[PDB]
Design an enzyme around this catalytic site. Structure first.
Site, short mmCIF file in Angstrom:
data_model
loop_
_atom_site.label_atom_id
_atom_site.label_comp_id
_atom_site.label_asym_id
_atom_site.label_seq_id
_atom_site.Cartn_x
_atom_site.Cartn_y
_atom_site.Cartn_z
N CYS A 109 2.68 3.41 -4.73
CA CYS A 109 2.17 4.70 -4.27
C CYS A 109 3.31 5.45 -3.61
CB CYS A 109 1.00 4.42 -3.30
SG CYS A 109 -0.41 3.63 -4.15
N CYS A 157 3.78 5.22 0.15
CA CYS A 157 3.55 3.92 0.78
C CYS A 157 4.84 3.28 1.26
CB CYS A 157 2.84 2.96 -0.16
SG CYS A 157 2.53 1.37 0.69
N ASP A 167 -0.26 -3.00 12.68
CA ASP A 167 0.21 -2.99 11.28
C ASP A 167 1.25 -1.93 10.97
OD1 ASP A 167 -1.35 -0.75 10.96
OD2 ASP A 167 -2.95 -1.83 9.88
N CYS A 197 -0.52 16.52 28.12
CA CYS A 197 -1.84 15.92 27.97
C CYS A 197 -2.58 15.88 29.30
CB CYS A 197 -1.72 14.49 27.43
SG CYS A 197 -0.98 14.38 25.79
C1 LIG Z 1 -1.11 -0.24 3.01
S1 LIG Z 1 -2.63 -0.24 2.04
C2 LIG Z 1 -2.97 -2.04 1.99
C3 LIG Z 1 -4.21 -2.37 1.16
C4 LIG Z 1 -4.29 -1.90 -0.31
N1 LIG Z 1 -3.06 -2.16 -1.00
C5 LIG Z 1 -4.77 -0.46 -0.44
O1 LIG Z 1 -4.12 0.42 -1.01
O2 LIG Z 1 -5.84 -0.17 0.06
C6 LIG Z 1 -3.82 0.18 3.36
C7 LIG Z 1 -4.14 1.67 3.45
O3 LIG Z 1 -2.99 2.29 4.01
C8 LIG Z 1 -2.80 3.51 3.31
N2 LIG Z 1 -1.42 4.04 3.33
C9 LIG Z 1 -0.39 3.78 2.47
N3 LIG Z 1 0.68 4.54 2.83
C10 LIG Z 1 0.32 5.31 3.88
C11 LIG Z 1 0.99 6.25 4.64
N4 LIG Z 1 2.24 6.60 4.37
N5 LIG Z 1 0.30 6.83 5.67
C12 LIG Z 1 -1.00 6.50 5.95
N6 LIG Z 1 -1.66 5.57 5.20
C13 LIG Z 1 -1.00 5.01 4.17
C14 LIG Z 1 -3.16 3.15 1.87
O4 LIG Z 1 -3.42 4.23 1.02
C15 LIG Z 1 -4.41 2.32 2.11
O5 LIG Z 1 -5.57 3.15 2.20
S1 SF4 Z 2 0.05 -1.46 -0.57
FE1 SF4 Z 2 0.89 0.61 -0.75
S2 SF4 Z 2 1.72 0.70 -2.94
FE2 SF4 Z 2 0.24 -0.95 -2.77
S3 SF4 Z 2 -1.76 -0.08 -3.46
FE3 SF4 Z 2 -1.80 -0.16 -1.15
S4 SF4 Z 2 -0.98 1.95 -0.67
FE4 SF4 Z 2 -0.42 1.67 -2.87
S1 SF4 Z 3 -4.61 17.94 22.16
FE1 SF4 Z 3 -4.34 15.75 22.52
S2 SF4 Z 3 -2.10 15.43 22.21
FE2 SF4 Z 3 -2.42 17.66 22.53
S3 SF4 Z 3 -2.13 17.97 24.78
FE3 SF4 Z 3 -4.32 17.69 24.40
S4 SF4 Z 3 -4.67 15.50 24.76
FE4 SF4 Z 3 -2.44 15.75 24.45
#
Ligand SMILES: C[S@@+](CC[C@H](N)C(=O)[O-])C[C@H]1O[C@@H](n2cnc3c(N)ncnc32)[C@H](O)[C@@H]1O
Ligand code: SF4
Ligand code: SF4
Ligand code: SF4
Ligand SMILES: [Cl-]
EC number: 1.8.98.7
Length: 381
Positions: free
Chosen positions: A18, A21, A274, A314
């Site tokens: 992705c 990712c 995580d 804040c």
């Molecule tokens: C890292 S994946 C692990 C599990 C599985 N591979 C999946 O895609 O659901 C967990 C979640 O984190 C999201 N994720 C991946 N990259 C991200 C990013 N840059 N910012 C926020 N969420 C992200 C994925 O789309 C997914 O919904």
């Molecule tokens: S771990 Fe990352 S590359 Fe893999 S399916 Fe989940 S979001 Fe996509």
């Molecule tokens: S909106 Fe949230 S992050 Fe922005 S000043 Fe208020 S409490 Fe802080």
């Protein structure tokens, strides 16, 4: 206390690539520890079951956790059955890209009461733009296939949708697609740029102005459905309602400060969150140390302590009791530096001025139904 772990049983291994990712092993700038060995799984499960009180929770993520294979999960369930000497309630959950789900998986997940998070970014074109396989081909039909299996076998699931700049430009298409599919438990995850990079530089990057537009539009769709008696659970809006009514939220990142999430890599190494599976936040190994010992490490203590700093803006903010500064990961701009203002501060302020009047109404409406929906985002009942 109750114990909750986030386990990566196939480590960072994944069959997709992705675009946004940063979690997978073939990704940007992430070592893979391979598949968690039977010995490590056994150690981990027995330890949690012996050291937890009240209940415990095992969440399987990655990477794509289904790459560990169905047999791994069968052995997990046998361990839980054999070694739960305190007769604790156990919660299990799986976050998956869905692409390997078949009838055998759907039956297993239904029979064993897993809560499943299924990643889906919207209708075909929106999903496929970023969520591509390792050959660069499309994945949306495989994810739809997984959702249909989950429906057929009565697996409890939430949809996890990443909010990219494209999502923000097309809330109508995304919300309408999920509505057509009768997906009523939704979680929208802000797209994060890679840690410590300058933010907002990729075409998918969710800039604050994009996120304001997203929040306002999504709220209007959600509220409209609410008025018409269609309940759709959106994790953030529900967390706002529960903060309004209970003073705290069940979602990490809405309470102002960090918690130790007990992320366990496939070698048994433990991390506090995580977003922070990095060597400098490596707490120890679950084979060697108790959960208390891990929590009590200097590293964990420091990780949590860093998040207690309240930005000066804040402290004076009218929305502070609602927002609490947001998630630490959205405040962590530079390596080994003090946290800054939340990246999305401005978005939250503008959204709250727009939505706060209506949020109360729903808060006054609720009750048991709101608590139950909020729980569905956390664990199988
Ligand atoms: C890292 S994946 C692990 C599990 C599985 N591979 C999946 O895609 O659901 C967990 C979640 O984190 C999201 N994720 C991946 N990259 C991200 C990013 N840059 N910012 C926020 N969420 C992200 C994925 O789309 C997914 O919904
Ligand atoms: S771990 Fe990352 S590359 Fe893999 S399916 Fe989940 S979001 Fe996509
Ligand atoms: S909106 Fe949230 S992050 Fe922005 S000043 Fe208020 S409490 Fe802080
Ligand atoms: S960085 Fe965010 S998700 Fe991680 S522990 Fe802190 S508040 Fe929770
Ligand atoms: Cl959400």
């Amino acid at each position: 206390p109750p114990l909750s772990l986030l386990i990566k049983p196939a480590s960072s291994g994944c069959n997709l690539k992705c675009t946004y990712c940063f979690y997978h092993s073939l990704s940007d700038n992430v070592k893979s520890y391979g598949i968690m060995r039977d010995e490590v799984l056994e150690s981990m499960v027995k330890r949690v079951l012996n050291e937890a009180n009240g209940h415990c929770s095992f969440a399987f993520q990655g990477g794509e956790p289904t790459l560990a294979g169905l047999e791994f999960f069968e052995k997990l369930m046998e361990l839980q059955r054999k070694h739960n000497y305190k007769n604790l309630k156990i919660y299990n959950s799986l976050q998956t890209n869905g692409t390997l789900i078949d009838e055998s998986w759907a039956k297993f997940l239904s029979e064993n009461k897993f809560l499943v998070g299924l990643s889906m970014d919207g209708p075909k074109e929106i999903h496929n733009l970023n969520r591509k396989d390792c050959c660069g081909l499309d994945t949306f039909s495989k994810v739809e296939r997984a959702a249909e299996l989950f429906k057929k076998y009565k697996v409890e699931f939430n949809i996890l949708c990443v909010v990219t700049s494209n999502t923000a430009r097309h809330v109508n298409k995304v919300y309408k697609y999920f509505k057509e599919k009768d997906f009523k438990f939704l979680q929208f995850i802000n797209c994060l740029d890679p840690l410590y990079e300058e933010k907002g530089k990729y075409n998918y990057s969710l800039k604050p102005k994009d996120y304001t537009k997203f929040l306002k539009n999504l709220f209007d769709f959600w509220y409209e459905d609410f008025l018409n008696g269609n309940r759709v659970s959106i994790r953030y809006f529900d967390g706002l309602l529960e903060t309004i009514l209970l003073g705290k939220s069940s979602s990490c990142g809405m309470n102002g400060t960090c918690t130790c999430q007990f992320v366990v890599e496939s070698d048994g190494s433990v991390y506090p969150c995580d977003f922070y599976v990095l060597d400098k936040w490596r707490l120890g190994n679950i084979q060697d140390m108790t959960m208390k010992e891990l929590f009590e490490t200097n590293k964990n203590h420091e990780f949590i302590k860093l998040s207690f700093k309240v930005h000066e803006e804040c402290k004076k903010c009218k929305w502070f009791r609602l927002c609490k500064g947001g998630c630490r990961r959205c405040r962590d701009s530079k390596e080994d530096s003090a946290l800054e203002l939340n990246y999305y501060c401005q978005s939250y302020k503008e959204f709250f001025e727009y939505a706060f009047p209506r949020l109360i109404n729903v808060a006054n409406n609720i009750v048991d139904k709101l608590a139950a929906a909020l729980e569905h985002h956390h664990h199988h009942h």
